[PDB]
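Appendix B. Extra example for self-study. Work through it before the problem class; the solution is given directly after the inputs so you can check yourself.
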Amino acid sequence: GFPLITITVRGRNVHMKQEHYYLWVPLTFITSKSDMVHRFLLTKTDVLILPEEVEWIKFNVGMNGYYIVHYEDDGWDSLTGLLKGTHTAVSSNDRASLINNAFQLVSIGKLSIEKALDLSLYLKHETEIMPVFQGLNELIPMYKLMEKRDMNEVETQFKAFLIRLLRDLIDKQTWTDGSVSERMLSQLLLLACVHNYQPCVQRAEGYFRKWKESNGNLSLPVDVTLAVFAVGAQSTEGWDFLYSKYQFSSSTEKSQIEFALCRTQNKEKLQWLLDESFKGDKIKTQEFPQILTLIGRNPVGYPLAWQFLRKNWNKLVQKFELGSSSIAHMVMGTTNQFSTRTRLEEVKGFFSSLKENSQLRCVQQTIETIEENIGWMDKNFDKIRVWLQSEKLERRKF
Amino acid sequence: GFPLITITVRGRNVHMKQEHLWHVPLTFITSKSDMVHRFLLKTKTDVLILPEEVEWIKFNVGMNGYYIVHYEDGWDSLTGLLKGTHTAVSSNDRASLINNAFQLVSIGKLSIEKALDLSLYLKHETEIMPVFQGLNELIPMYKLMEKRDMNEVETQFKAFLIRLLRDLIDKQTWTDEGSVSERMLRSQLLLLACVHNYQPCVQRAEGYFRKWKESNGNLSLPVDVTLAVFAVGAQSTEGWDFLYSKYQSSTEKSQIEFALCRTQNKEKLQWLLDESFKGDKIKTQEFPQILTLIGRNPVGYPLAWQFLRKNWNKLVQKFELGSSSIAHMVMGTTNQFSTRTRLEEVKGFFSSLKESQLRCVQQTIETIEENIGWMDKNFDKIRVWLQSEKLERRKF
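Solution. Structure tokens for the complete assembly:
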């Protein structure tokens, strides 16, 4: 029930529609040769009429912080081109807005993934956190949808794309600790490393092997620590050594080792964590929800955390209330990345039989997120298969 | 990066060697094994022993890891492979060798003569990926030549380039109907032919253009050939003028945009820079791509450079120094230089802007200081190598 303020410009005649995905809408914008910000308030349609004729127009609807803008064809192509050559002209949070809405409209069915992606390609030049983060925030859920389906080829290619994009910025991070922002941008080191960018997955191994070769006495930078452990847990000696430290020793490493422990393709170890977390003795049950969410997020262990959750639901609600923050969160972490009608009806088929235990906001919120996923992917899989098979192509004449 | 992993082989003894404390995960395929093998060079040098003897071996498979391979003793055997049976290797791997071959001409140890030889098999190359690689390895050479007074060698190269691609150039149907990359090859090969003045592509493009003009652009042009069609139309005032009328679709502009900057009309080349800057008759947000493209133009290159320096105070204000934008511009106006005089022209300008000390500048100078000595070393070798390709030399 949020806005959907369609925009059609002709010359300096700026028409704008209303469908509000009536209402009342305190539109804001920034034009091309403006270096300033403007005011307006929409009936169904209106026009405002621009003073001078200008090249591009960026509606950042002054409605609180959340708004949905659509400029259709030519309009998005004007903006796509601004970022692709002169993205510095606009701000970081406007960098975000664009990226955010570009993808919003893809799932709403007013913009095609081909185009929302044919934009993400400028991020190779983005040297700021906010847009990069946004980018990842919109692009990551796609491939996690893929991870839960027969899709190795396009998964891998997507990720290559994603890493290929970010590489420059990845490659210029010192392995140390900038401001609260630069240090957090850490996330790249991890993400690089998780996806096998090899100058990442070679130095982390180094840092890890040494660290454990002092029984974890080396001081690792905090920023690096996640990547370091994330490659560590991919080997049996790695998992075990790091897990011995978890119990034996601090507050933040905990989380970092907690996070890094679940990032394992070992189906045995994984099962272990669900199990013991459940108890409380080895891993305390105070953080079973988080462990369950992350395992759901694993590429191999997604079917475990759902299976476990179902096989032992009767006992989770005795231990975490029938419907609560934890429980809801748990429901959603083991189901909302499913992209099949086969997963959907199981997700429906389970909860719609608990009767007394069966109809919470998390249940019907999740089914929908899956019913979106089904349609989204059906529409877009084949599309994004090619958009990537049509990107690594002359990625210079005369 | 830039580890240089030297490979010497005697029988089954396969010696690595290292260059710039590196740890290097090595991978390799042979004439016996299609399988990508594994080897971790952690020490400076090492060896391995292949199970049986091999006609050839090749390292860094599919270009997955960042190391460049030079084959000692070697390269000769990898050539004859591609010259006789290139279908035995894979497509991505055909690219590797072309990249590397020419790469190692950068740093030496491999002569231009031998790298250029390798590129000869492309006469039979029936796949997007290697074709492209060969183009974008060879092209940046005659781009360096265009910016000097080496016409006879420039033209001789260019013809060569075409002669090389020709059989495949004539194979493209002037339509769309194709899968991905299939349609991209026609896209790009028709252009190349046309720009280098291959007549059968220049004559077809004049026709398509001509009849399109005789319709007020109401003629159906296939997307692929559109570039070539326009690329040759803008070589006359009636065609440049016409296309701009059309300029003022989301993709049509880009072709007409590109096709415009090809004109050797240094008068209207100026007009594009000037009016792109204003933002009125062409967008301001498009000055980066028009400046970089005028950079490449064999006759207009000086303007785009000249315009930048004469007008640098308004671009740094308009787009902000140290941007994606400004760096792209600096490097596109200057990276194809290949003389000492041009060097001091770069160093002289940018360093005098007081605070100058940013990536592109430091980056460009390095790119030109590498050009200079590349050309010193290679121009003559290439001059004479060309004089020999033409040698069909069929006896008995």
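Self-check: Chain A touches chain B through 28 residues (CB under 8 Å). If your reasoning did not lead you there, revisit section 3.
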